[PDB]
Amino acid sequence: IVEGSDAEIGMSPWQVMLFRKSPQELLCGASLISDRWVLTAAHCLLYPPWDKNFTENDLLVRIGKHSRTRYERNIEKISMLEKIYIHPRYNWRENLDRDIALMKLKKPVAFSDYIHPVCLPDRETAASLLQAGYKGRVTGWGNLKETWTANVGKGQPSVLQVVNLPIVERPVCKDSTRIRITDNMFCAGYKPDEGKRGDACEGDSGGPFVMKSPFNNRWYQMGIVSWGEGCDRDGKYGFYTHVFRLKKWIQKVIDQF
């Protein structure tokens, strides 16, 4: 996350870290939607252009975390993947259309003060909140800057980062890039005139874009960190998978498996 701030403890209890077993590294963010289902971006698991095609045993998910690098004893829980399900029409060849995947856990993770699921939007909540100007929240352990940096030149965070960003009008999203945008995507971020900044960055993808419903005070995951060009560049916006638009697939997978 670029230009965000440290998350408060228990602020994003549905946050999940997708961790490569060997070599141990942060691959992506993800979100907890029930005790046995984790939601993420399909490109976190499958992206042929980069020779990426993970299998269940290549990965581990860490839930309940705050610190990026530390093993958080008595707090975080490790869960293993029983099965990965990628949207059948995920378009990795062109524009990451339908960038969504589900991971079923081998055993249910135990909820606690630091582990709790986020809700998925119903049609009405999505129609009401997914509007230009309305802000959502992005969280992750990704890089703090576009310019390749680590723990020596303000590169990676010590703890979970958070940033609130406004959804952008679709024509403005379209006009900011040469990539073909689809209805299964929305973009968010501040414009150059607005002053405030912020964006997701390397390592944040797969993570959640959430909104707190003013109708029932519950947090809903409206998007999945999908793609961008650079990080926090003026005139560019982060792109997110439209979760409600792909919910039929989500429901089909969960009901079936």
Partner: peptide, 10 residues
């Protein structure tokens, strides 16, 4: 730079 995940935890 990741602290190792102790067995038992897995």
């Amino acid at each position: 730079d990741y602290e190792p995940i102790p067995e038992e935890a897995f």
